[PDB]
Enzyme design. Structure first.
Site, PDB file in Angstrom:
ATOM      1  N   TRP A   1      -6.527  -6.937   6.023  1.00 17.24           N
ATOM      2  CA  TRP A   1      -7.833  -7.626   6.184  1.00 17.24           C
ATOM      3  C   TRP A   1      -7.940  -8.496   7.430  1.00 17.24           C
ATOM      4  O   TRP A   1      -7.011  -9.213   7.778  1.00 17.24           O
ATOM      5  CB  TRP A   1      -8.117  -8.535   5.005  1.00 17.24           C
ATOM      6  CG  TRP A   1      -8.500  -7.732   3.848  1.00 17.24           C
ATOM      7  CD1 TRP A   1      -7.670  -7.225   2.882  1.00 17.24           C
ATOM      8  CD2 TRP A   1      -9.807  -7.285   3.547  1.00 17.24           C
ATOM      9  NE1 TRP A   1      -8.407  -6.487   1.986  1.00 17.24           N
ATOM     10  CE2 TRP A   1      -9.725  -6.527   2.360  1.00 17.24           C
ATOM     11  CE3 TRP A   1     -11.055  -7.469   4.151  1.00 17.24           C
ATOM     12  CZ2 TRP A   1     -10.843  -5.934   1.775  1.00 17.24           C
ATOM     13  CZ3 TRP A   1     -12.183  -6.890   3.553  1.00 17.24           C
ATOM     14  CH2 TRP A   1     -12.057  -6.124   2.380  1.00 17.24           C
ATOM     15  N   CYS A   2      -9.114  -8.427   8.055  1.00 17.72           N
ATOM     16  CA  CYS A   2      -9.499  -9.330   9.153  1.00 17.72           C
ATOM     17  C   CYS A   2      -8.614  -9.133  10.354  1.00 17.72           C
ATOM     18  O   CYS A   2      -8.301 -10.074  11.068  1.00 17.72           O
ATOM     19  CB  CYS A   2      -9.464 -10.798   8.701  1.00 17.72           C
ATOM     20  SG  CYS A   2     -10.501 -11.158   7.261  1.00 17.72           S
ATOM     21  N   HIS A   3      -8.140  -7.914  10.528  1.00 13.82           N
ATOM     22  CA  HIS A   3      -7.720  -7.436  11.836  1.00 13.82           C
ATOM     23  C   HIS A   3      -8.069  -5.957  11.973  1.00 13.82           C
ATOM     24  O   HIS A   3      -8.645  -5.355  11.056  1.00 13.82           O
ATOM     25  CB  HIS A   3      -6.264  -7.801  12.140  1.00 13.82           C
ATOM     26  CG  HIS A   3      -5.244  -7.014  11.388  1.00 13.82           C
ATOM     27  ND1 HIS A   3      -3.906  -7.052  11.715  1.00 13.82           N
ATOM     28  CD2 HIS A   3      -5.354  -6.172  10.335  1.00 13.82           C
ATOM     29  CE1 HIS A   3      -3.236  -6.266  10.882  1.00 13.82           C
ATOM     30  NE2 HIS A   3      -4.093  -5.734  10.032  1.00 13.82           N
TER      31      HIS A   3
ATOM     32  N   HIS B   1      -0.349  -2.024   6.539  1.00 13.25           N
ATOM     33  CA  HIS B   1       0.013  -3.420   6.762  1.00 13.25           C
ATOM     34  C   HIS B   1      -0.348  -4.303   5.592  1.00 13.25           C
ATOM     35  O   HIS B   1      -1.528  -4.445   5.193  1.00 13.25           O
ATOM     36  CB  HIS B   1      -0.607  -3.990   8.046  1.00 13.25           C
ATOM     37  CG  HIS B   1      -0.319  -5.445   8.226  1.00 13.25           C
ATOM     38  ND1 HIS B   1       0.941  -5.917   8.494  1.00 13.25           N
ATOM     39  CD2 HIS B   1      -1.105  -6.532   8.071  1.00 13.25           C
ATOM     40  CE1 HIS B   1       0.924  -7.230   8.520  1.00 13.25           C
ATOM     41  NE2 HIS B   1      -0.308  -7.631   8.259  1.00 13.25           N
ATOM     42  N   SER B   2       0.696  -4.915   5.042  1.00 12.13           N
ATOM     43  CA  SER B   2       0.538  -5.951   4.005  1.00 12.13           C
ATOM     44  C   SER B   2      -0.546  -5.599   2.985  1.00 12.13           C
ATOM     45  O   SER B   2      -0.421  -4.609   2.307  1.00 12.13           O
ATOM     46  CB  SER B   2       0.302  -7.291   4.673  1.00 12.13           C
ATOM     47  OG  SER B   2       0.366  -8.326   3.719  1.00 12.13           O
TER      48      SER B   2
ATOM     49  N   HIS C   1       5.752 -11.447  10.039  1.00 15.54           N
ATOM     50  CA  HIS C   1       4.986 -10.687   9.081  1.00 15.54           C
ATOM     51  C   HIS C   1       4.453  -9.371   9.662  1.00 15.54           C
ATOM     52  O   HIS C   1       3.912  -8.543   8.907  1.00 15.54           O
ATOM     53  CB  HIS C   1       3.829 -11.588   8.609  1.00 15.54           C
ATOM     54  CG  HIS C   1       2.892 -10.959   7.629  1.00 15.54           C
ATOM     55  ND1 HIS C   1       3.314 -10.269   6.512  1.00 15.54           N
ATOM     56  CD2 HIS C   1       1.544 -10.988   7.566  1.00 15.54           C
ATOM     57  CE1 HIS C   1       2.259  -9.898   5.809  1.00 15.54           C
ATOM     58  NE2 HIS C   1       1.176 -10.321   6.428  1.00 15.54           N
TER      59      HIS C   1
HETATM   60  C1  LIG Z   1      -3.857  -8.897   8.804  1.00 14.99           C
HETATM   61  C2  LIG Z   1      -3.423  -9.619   7.548  1.00 14.99           C
HETATM   62  O1  LIG Z   1      -2.230  -9.802   7.370  1.00 14.99           O
HETATM   63  N1  LIG Z   1      -4.463 -10.003   6.792  1.00 14.99           N
HETATM   64  C3  LIG Z   1      -4.499 -10.825   5.711  1.00 14.99           C
HETATM   65  C4  LIG Z   1      -5.651 -11.633   5.606  1.00 14.99           C
HETATM   66  C5  LIG Z   1      -5.803 -12.583   4.597  1.00 14.99           C
HETATM   67  C6  LIG Z   1      -4.777 -12.797   3.667  1.00 14.99           C
HETATM   68  C7  LIG Z   1      -3.608 -12.040   3.727  1.00 14.99           C
HETATM   69  C8  LIG Z   1      -3.424 -11.063   4.717  1.00 14.99           C
HETATM   70  C9  LIG Z   1      -2.209 -10.201   4.697  1.00 14.99           C
HETATM   71  O2  LIG Z   1      -2.450  -8.954   4.814  1.00 14.99           O
HETATM   72  O3  LIG Z   1      -1.061 -10.616   4.521  1.00 14.99           O
END
Ligand SMILES: CC(=O)Nc1ccccc1C(=O)O
Ligand SMILES: [K+]
Ligand SMILES: [K+]
Length: 274
Positions: A35-37, A99-100, A250
């Site tokens: 999220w948010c990238h 990713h994550s 991370h």
């Molecule tokens: C890019 C990224 O790690 N985005 C996230 C945004 C909000 C909360 C957690 C994460 C995550 O993926 O770890």
């Protein structure tokens, strides 16, 4: 690089995505952002994979070089988006790599696409246990319209883990600078809901109708108790494995792209022998 960036209409939304349009044997490598990238997180990993694989990176609704506000959506919609791009592109067999918390998309994609189309998955640096106090607070902060930025700052601190890691700092401070509360608050609601409803990544993966090989490659959390929940889960499930990558942050896709690449090639090769 940005030579592979495209845009297409996906149901209601114009989405950008990377596609190197490599003419080669499958499966395609589908790199899923958190999220948010956006796809920028994967520029070093695309370099590792470019010559040998077809590589596709979808950006989510309201994500990309020009972030925008959009209506509420969750990992379910991310999955429908990812498949619509793959349908438009004529891609059959794919190996997803997340990713994550892109992991929620990856595991639901595995269910939906099935084991012929999506025979394996690789999850990168994805918190396997239910939220510990610090992370749970982070999510609550992201959801808060008065404290979301404080939220991101605390997450950037954990993510960098005390490292002056030039490329990852660049990603967080520059490449994610244009994302606002519309994204970050949503990321908080979605991730919190995902744990609330699925228990955990481990539980969700265990609950797949058709289990299949999934590897968790991670650099953090770095403590022994986190390796142990991974080893314990692996002891219990033939299809699960993991590898501790030893990268500083991370974002192994950025700081150890060569290591992420050899795990993805191992899985791709296994599928081809198949
Ligand atoms: C890019 C990224 O790690 N985005 C996230 C945004 C909000 C909360 C957690 C994460 C995550 O993926 O770890
Ligand atoms: K350094
Ligand atoms: K195992």
């Amino acid at each position: 690089t940005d030579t592979y960036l495209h845009e297409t209409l996906v149901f209601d939304n114009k989405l950008s995505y990377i596609d190197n349009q490599r003419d080669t044997d499958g499966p395609a490598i589908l790199l899923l952002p958190g999220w948010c990238h956006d796809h920028r997180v994967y520029k070093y990993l695309i370099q590792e994979l470019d010559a040998d694989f077809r590589v596709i990176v979808p950006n989510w609704r309201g994500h990309g070089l020009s972030p925008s506000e959009v209506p509420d959506f969750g990992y379910q919609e991310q999955v429908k988006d990812a498949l619509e791009i793959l349908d438009q592109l004529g891609v059959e067999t794919f190996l997803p790599v997340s990713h994550s918390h892109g992991g929620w998309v990856l595991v639901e994609l595995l269910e939906q696409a099935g084991p012929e189309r999506a025979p394996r998955g690789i999850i990168m640096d994805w918190l396997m246990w239910a939220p510990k106090p610090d992370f749970a607070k982070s999510l609550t902060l992201l959801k808060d319209p008065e404290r979301w930025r404080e939220g991101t700052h605390g997450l950037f601190d954990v993510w960098l883990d005390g490292h002056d890691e030039k490329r990852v700092r660049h990603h967080l401070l520059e490449e994610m600078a244009d994302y606002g509360y519309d994204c970050w608050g949503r990321s908080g609601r979605v991730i919190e809901d995902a744990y609330g409803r699925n228990g955990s990544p481990m539980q969700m993966m265990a609950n797949l109708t058709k289990t299949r090989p999934i590897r968790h490659i991670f650099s953090q959390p770095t403590e022994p108790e986190y390796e142990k929940i991974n080893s314990d889960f692996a002891e219990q499930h033939p299809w699960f494995s993991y590898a501790k990558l030893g990268g500083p942050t991370h974002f192994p896709a950025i700081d150890v792209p060569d290591r992420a690449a050899v795990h993805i090639r191992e899985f791709a090769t296994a599928i081809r022998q198949g």
